[PDB]
Design a protein around this ligand. Sequence first.
Ligand SMILES: COC(=O)[C@H](Cc1cccc(C(=N)N)c1)NC(=O)CNS(=O)(=O)c1ccc(C)cc1
Ligand SMILES: [Ca+2]
Length: 223
Amino acid sequence: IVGGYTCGANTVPYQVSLNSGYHFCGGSLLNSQWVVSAAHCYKSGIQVRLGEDNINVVEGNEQFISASKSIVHPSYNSETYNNDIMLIKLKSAASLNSRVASISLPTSCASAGTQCLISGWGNTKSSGTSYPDVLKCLKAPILSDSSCKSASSFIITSNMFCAGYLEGGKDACQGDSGGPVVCSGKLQGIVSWGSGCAQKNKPGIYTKVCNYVSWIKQTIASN
Ligand SMILES: COC(=O)[C@H](Cc1cccc(C(=N)N)c1)NC(=O)CNS(=O)(=O)c1ccc(C)cc1
Ligand SMILES: [Ca+2]
């Protein structure tokens, strides 16, 4: 997260870190047994880390639980990142508490201009690299598709939205992928892609979660 702020320990209790020896992506807890992340974060041997603030220090509220199954969206396209969404089932249910908690799925989508909270342990620099230990947070609005497309020339699909600031300085970044975009109490986005980080006229691109809720619910019901 570039241009954000330190969230405060466990203030984003649905935020998970995906670990394969090291943090590599974010995720969001959606019930005690399931995490949602980006398909482009898929790998085998994922350990889900819940209750994290400092990812390099055991502070006392963590739960480390191995993935038992990962399910990449049936129509995920790795070239364009269309349908960049994945479900991860935990080998054992998380013990839910004030620091390890689910985020509600939307019943309807979020409109342009709606303010959201984006969070993660990604790079905090727009030029070069610096990776934080504690969770970072950013408030950012959803942009209209037309403004986003005209400013950026990005090719996006109806399964993506743009959020951030066209002027630059505030954005998600490498290492935030898979993590949450929460707007008005609902998980509306997953950190997916962009061009650099926090560059002018290059806002962040997010998987549009509202389009996937029926798939999420039926997948969870059957697995
Ligand atoms: C700094 O490193 C990068 O090049 C960015 C990081 C990144 C990741 C996620 C979000 C942002 C953001 N600024 N909001 C930035 N990667 C990428 O930006 C994308 N990875 S990518 O290069 O593999 C890629 C690019 C474009 C498509 C359609 C699909 C995949
Ligand atoms: Ca920790």
